[PDB]
Amino acid sequence: NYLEIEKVIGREIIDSRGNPTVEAEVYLAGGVTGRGTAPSGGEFEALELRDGDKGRFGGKGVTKAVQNINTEISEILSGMDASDIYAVDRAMIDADGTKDKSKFGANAVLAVSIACAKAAAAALGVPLYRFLGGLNANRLPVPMMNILNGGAHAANTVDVQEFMIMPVGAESFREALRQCTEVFHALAGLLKSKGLATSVGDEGGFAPDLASDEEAIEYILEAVKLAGYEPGRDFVLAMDAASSEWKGEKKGEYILPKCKRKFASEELVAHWKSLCERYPIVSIEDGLDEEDWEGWQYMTRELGDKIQLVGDDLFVTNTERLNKGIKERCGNSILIKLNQIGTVSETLEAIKMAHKAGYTAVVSHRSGETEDTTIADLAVALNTGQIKTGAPSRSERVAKYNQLLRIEEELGDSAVYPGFTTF
- Which of these ranges, 126-134, 253-261, 264-272, 282-290, lies near a second copy under the rule CB under 8 A? 126-134
Distance CA 342, CA 108 (A): 9
Which residue's Cβ has the minimum distance to Mg ion?
A: 312
Q: Residue 37 in contact with residue 13, Cβ under 8 Å?
A: yes
408 binds, among Mg ion, a second copy, none (CB under 5 to 8 A by kind): none
**Interface residues for a second copy in 173-212 (CB under 8 A)?**
177-178, 181-182, 184-185, 197, 199-201, 204, 207
Q: Does 182 bind Mg ion (CB under 5 A)?
A: no
Distance CA 166, CA 242 (A): 19
378-416 in b/e form (b: 16+ CB < 10 A) is bbbbbbbbbbbbbbbbbebbbbbbebbeebbeebeeebb
337 in catalytic set: yes
**Interface residues for a second copy in 10-29 (CB under 8 A)?**
11-20, 23
C-alpha Rg value of the chain to the nearest Å: 21
Q: Does 240 bind Mg ion (CB under 5 A)?
A: yes
Q: Residue 344 in contact with residue 89, Cβ under 8 Å?
A: yes
Q: Does 77 bind a second copy (CB under 8 A)?
A: no
Residue in 25, 203, 290, 396 annotated catalytic: 203
H-run or E-run covering 217: helix 213-226
DSSP codes of every residue in 244-297:
GG-B-SSTTEEE-TTT--EEEHHHHHHHHHHHHHHS-EEEEES-S-TT-HHHHH
- Please tell me the count of residues contacting Mg ion according to CB under 5 A: 3
Of 104 and 129, nearer to a second copy (C-beta) is 129
**Interface residues for a second copy in 380-409 (CB under 8 A)?**
381-383, 391-396, 398-399, 401-402, 405-406, 409
Q: Annotated binding residues for (2R)-2-phosphoglycerate, as ranges? A: 161, 337, 366-367, 388
**Interface residues for a second copy in 153-172 (CB under 8 A)?**
155
Q: Annotated binding residues, as ranges? A: 153, 161-162, 240, 285, 312, 337, 364-367, 388
| Contact partners, residue 294, CB within 8 Å, separation at least 6 | 252, 265
DSSP codes of every residue in 25-60:
EEEETTS-EEEEE--B---SS--------TTSGGGT
**Per-residue x/- mask for a second copy, residues 285 to 324, rule CB under 8 A?**
----------------------------------------
Reduce the DSSP state of residue 322 to 3 states and report it: helix
- Which of these ranges, 86-94, 259-267, 309-317, 394-402, lies near Mg ion under the rule CB under 5 A? 309-317
**Per-residue x/- mask for a second copy, residues 33 to 72, rule CB under 8 A?**
-----------------------xxx--------------
Q: Residue 38 in contact with residue 48, Cβ under 8 Å?
A: yes
Interacting residue with Mg ion among 292, 312, 346, 372 (CB under 5 A): 312
Of 101 and 130, nearer to a second copy (C-beta) is 130
Of 275 and 362, nearer to a second copy (C-beta) is 362
Burial class (CB in 10 A: 0-12, 13-18, 19+), 222: middle
Residue in 118, 337, 346, 369 annotated catalytic: 337
Q: What's the min distance (Å) between Cβ of 152 and a second copy?
A: 13
Residues in the chain, how many? Answer: 423
341 binds, among Mg ion, a second copy, none (CB under 5 to 8 A by kind): none
203 in catalytic set: yes
401 binds, among Mg ion, a second copy, none (CB under 5 to 8 A by kind): a second copy
Alpha carbon distances (Å) from 217 to 81, 161, 220: 50, 12, 5
Q: What's the min distance (Å) between Cβ of 390 and Mg ion?
A: 13
Q: Does 98 bind a second copy (CB under 8 A)?
A: no
Q: Residue 141 in contact with residue 106, Cβ under 8 Å?
A: no
Of 178 and 324, nearer to a second copy (C-beta) is 178
Q: Does 159 bind Mg ion (CB under 5 A)?
A: no
Q: What's the min distance (Å) between Cβ of 136 and a second copy?
A: 5
| Contact partners, residue 221, CB within 8 Å, separation at least 6 | 231, 237, 279, 280
- Which of these ranges, 69-77, 241-249, 336-344, 360-368, lies near Mg ion under the rule CB under 5 A? 241-249
Distance CA 92, CA 351 (A): 21
Under DSSP, the state recorded for 371 is S
Which residues are the active-site residues? 203, 337
Residues that bind Mg ion in the complex, under the rule CB under 5 A: 240, 242, 312
